[PDB]
Design a protein around this ligand. Structure first.
Ligand SMILES: [Mg+2]
Lengths: 231, 237
């Protein structure tokens, strides 16, 4: 693929991180534009200020000067599938329809059962119980080794940014949860109940594409400590 | 394709309806197995999905009645993944358009439905919450439509995903089913008849004209009878 590709994300967004992983896995040639957690020009990417976004094709332009020709795309999971469609050679999904369906179902488990709990527990200080159960549900869909469908796929691009932050926040004591709920979760994730999901995060954090788009625990940790809803 | 395909769904499920549309659009040789919603699910269904999850598809393995699932068949769940599955199995049906950009926009259209309207359909019709958000989300989905035709012009998985739900909410609305107040009832009907919602009104009847939808929908009256048996849809006395 030779069309130009620009990924727009706010500096520490897990949604942009999704697309960043996928572009790295794809070996894509792309421009990354990070906006500070908003400039007047961004209305030319998306009039509603929606982030992340990808511009595709049109002339090569600096990201703060998006062309009228380029196609503008939003919605992080669609962006994942889009990178895969543009770079089929990279096999960002497995080859078999059955395995691509399992990968997609894994992402559904995250979106439909865990995502909202993670937010309730870490950002709203709601009871932590449902979060742990949903984390276990996701964990139960993992095979005993490798990634969600064996090899790395869009499933990892989708969930890695969130699981990695959940752990980091948890290790750092960040989140609106009670001191007691904080302890319940910390012991939850260090217990054997969650050995699998913790190794999964480890294997994720070792992945080059993740390493490059994470920027390091220290940077994420400093961004982390500036989020009002983590207190 | 030459592997057997069997779709399992509870009768009248919009989620199974999704995959039903897709298999019709694909021209697939498939078997349909409807499970009664208000009966507690045959023991043999554990062999399709042990947690009783529906809808589900079995793929390949030996040709077999649906209540005799083979362990050699691959078993898939989650309705949006099932839509993408059907499309992957039958690339020649072009359930999704050919270019990555248009495919992305089809998936984004689905996300707008799931992110905004889906929960407001539940909240306004099944939980009785104020309906303003439902209308605003309806408008949000409407605004993603092009001037005419379907989400990305030609029919695509976008319609397979949203049609089962848009048809039922308008079905319910016309007929007065839902936990919503009667004031909010008249507000919704008046809004949907109004010019503000002409476009989504046009979209739903274009949806309803589609062969694959007609066949998998089985007529308003039976869907209406189905809906009148959903207790969560009823207002208390
Ligand atoms: Mg609500």
């Amino acid at each position: 693929c030779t069309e130009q590709i620009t990924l727009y994300t706010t500096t520490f967004s897990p949604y942009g991180h999704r697309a960043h992983i996928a572009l790295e896995e794809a070996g894509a040639e792309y421009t990354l534009c990070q906006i500070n957690v908003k400039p007047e020009w961004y209305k030319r990417v998306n009039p509603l200020g929606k982030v992340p976004a990808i511009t595709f094709g049109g002339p090569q332009v600096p990201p703060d000067e998006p062309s009228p020709e380029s196609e503008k795309l939003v919605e992080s999971l669609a962006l994942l599938e889009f990178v895969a469609d543009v770079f089929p050679e990279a096999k960002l999904l497995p080859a078999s329809p059955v395995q691509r369906a399992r990968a997609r179902a894994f992402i559904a488990i995250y979106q439909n059962y865990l995502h909202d709990q993670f937010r309730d527990a870490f950002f709203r200080g709601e009871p932590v119980g449902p979060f742990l159960q949903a984390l276990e549900t996701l964990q139960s869909a993992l095979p005993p080794a490798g990634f969600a469908v064996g090899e790395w796929s869009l499933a990892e691009a989708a969930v890695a940014p969130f699981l990695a932050r959940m752990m980091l926040y948890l290790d750092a004591g960040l989140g609106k949860y009670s001191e007691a709920d904080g302890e319940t979760m910390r012991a939850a994730l260090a217990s054997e109940r969650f050995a699998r999901i913790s190794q999964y995060v480890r294997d994720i954090r070792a992945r080059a594409s993740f390493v490059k788009s994470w920027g390091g625990d220290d940077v994420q940790l400093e961004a982390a400590k500036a989020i009002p809803m983590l207190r």
